[PDB]
């Protein structure tokens, strides 16, 4: 809801609100963020293809 310059600063820095895991079997929710490299654009724009 904030100004869209602060959204750009949030898009690269802060990790988003609970994406999936990486390299598991049943696709759990991510936790503790040790080496997590997830750039999802379907979260900010609120669309799906």
């Amino acid at each position: 809801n904030r100004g869209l310059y602060t959204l750009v600063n949030e898009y690269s820095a802060r990790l988003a609100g609970a994406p999936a895991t990486s390299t598991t079997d049943l696709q759990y929710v991510v936790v503790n963020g040790t080496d997590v490299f997830l750039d999802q654009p379907c979260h900010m724009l609120q669309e799906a293809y």
């Binding site: 503790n32 963020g33 040790t34 080496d35």
Partner: protein
């Protein structure tokens, strides 16, 4: 690589890889007829021998 996150900073690991030596053997067979060995040591004086 030294990292800047909160996980356990993992120590280096020295691998000891223990190899062997594959041996091989090669041989060829050569026939020499008995009429060839016999006139090899035989005494000769004529220009046909």
């Amino acid at each position: 690589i030294a990292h800047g996150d909160g996980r356990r900073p993992n120590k280096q690991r020295q691998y000891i890889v223990m190899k062997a030596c594959n041996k091989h053997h090669i041989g060829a067979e050569i026939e020499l007829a008995a009429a060839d060995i016999e006139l090899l040591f035989a005494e000769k004086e004529t220009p046909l021998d």
